[PDB]
Amino acid sequence: DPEVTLLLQCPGGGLPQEQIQAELSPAHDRRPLPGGDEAITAIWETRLKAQPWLFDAPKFRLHSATLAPIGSRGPQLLLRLGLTSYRDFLGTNWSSSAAWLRQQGATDWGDTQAYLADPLGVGAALATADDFLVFLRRSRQVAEAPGLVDVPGGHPEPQDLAGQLVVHELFSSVLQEICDEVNLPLLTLSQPLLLGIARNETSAGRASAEFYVQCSLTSEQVRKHYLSGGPEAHESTGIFFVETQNVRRLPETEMWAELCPSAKGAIILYNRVQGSPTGAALGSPALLPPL
Q1: Is residue 177 marked as binding?
Q2: Which residues, if any, are the signal sequence?
C-alpha cells in the first residue's frame, strides 16, 4: 500500500493519555519557502476570491514522535509538535507543486517535510459492544477523497507544562469528533488508546494519530443514533459495520480499494496493535485461524 506509511506503532496494546508527553515549540514549525511565503498567500487569495465564505483555522503540526525503550517505566512517548494552519496546508501539501517542495526540503534541510504544513489529523478504530468496527461513506461532492470509505476523525484546532494540555486536547478531540459525526452520547465511550501514527503519501506525507475507542452500544444502537440526527447532523452520507473477525483480512477484500489512506492506516494499526495476539490462549489455532 504505497499511499500509507507507518511512522509509529505503539506498545502494550496502545498508550493511554497519562503516558504521553508533548513538546510544542516554534522549532517544530514549517520552514519559510525558498522564494518566500508569498506563494501561499497568492493561492489563498485566489481561493477566497472564488469562495469568500471560507475561513482559516490553526492546526497542530507533526514534526516527529520518539518512543521510549520498550518495557521502561515512566513516560513512553514524546510528540514534537509545531503550529500550522488550513491556509498553509492549501499552499503546500495540497499544491500541485508539493513533490517539488519535498525535493527542495531534502536538498536544503535533509528533511522531505521541511517546507510542508503537515497538519496532524486524528482517527479512530471505534468498536461496538457486539464486536464490529464503525465505517462512514464520504460524499462524492467534497474535495478530498470523494466517495471513499473513512473512519471517524478530524483535524484538531489548538485551544510538559503546556505539553499536558496539548495531549489532553488531542485525546478529547477524537471523542468530540465521534460525538459530532456519529451522534453518540459521550458517556458510552471509553478513554482512547493511541495505536500509532500513519502518513498519507497522496497528501505529501501529512500524518494522523490513530486511536482505539470502545463503545458500550451495539451496532444496531450506534446506527439508530447516527440516523436520528437527520441528513444535516453528519458530513458523511452513510454508516456501516464490519465484524472485528473480518477486519483481520480487510486488505484482501474489494472494500480495501475504496478506503481513504488515513482510514487504511487506522485499520493496519488496529490489526497490528489490538489484533495480533502474543500469548498462548489467543494464539491457539481455534482462536487464531491459520491464513
Answers
A1: yes
A2: none
| Residue 45 lies inside a defined structural domain of this protein | yes
DSSP for the chain reads: -TTEEEEEE-STTSB-GGGEEEEE-GGGSPPPPTT-THHHHHHHHHHHTT-TT----EEEEEEEEEEPPTT-SS--EEEEEEEEEHHHHHHTTTSTTHHHHHHHHHHHHS-TTTT---BPEEEEEEE-TTSEEEEEEPPTTSSSSTT-EE-SEE-PPP--TTHHHHHHHHHHHHHHHHHHHH---GGGBPPPEEEEEEEEGGGTTEEEEEEEEEBSS-HHHHHHHHHHT-GGG-SSSEEEEEEHHHHTTGGGSTTGGGB-HHHHHHHHHIIIIISS--STTTTSTTTS---
The number of domains in the chain is: 1
Domain of 144, in residue numbers:
1-277
The dihedrals phi and psi of 286, each to the nearest 5 degrees, come to: -70, -30
Grid cell locating 16: 493511554
Dist. CA 184–CA 224, nearest whole Å: 10
CA separation for the pair 28, 225 (Å, rounded): 40
286 within a domain of the structure (yes/no):
no
Confirm whether 26 is domain-assigned.
yes
Residue pair 39/94 in contact by the 8 Å Cβ criterion: no
Contact 77, 21 (CB under 8 A): yes
> CA 245, CA 260: separation in Å to the nearest integer?
21
In a domain, 44, yes or no: yes
Asked whether residue 155 is marked as a ligand-binding residue, the answer is yes
Instruction: Determine if residue 209 is labeled as part of a ligand binding site.
Output: no
> Per the annotation, does 1 bind a ligand?
no
Check whether 150 is labelled as a binding-site residue: yes
Q: How far apart are CA 177 and CA 123, in angstroms?
A: 9
Question: Does the annotation place 258 within a ligand binding site?
Answer: no
Experimental method: X-ray
State yes or no: 86 annotated in a binding site: yes
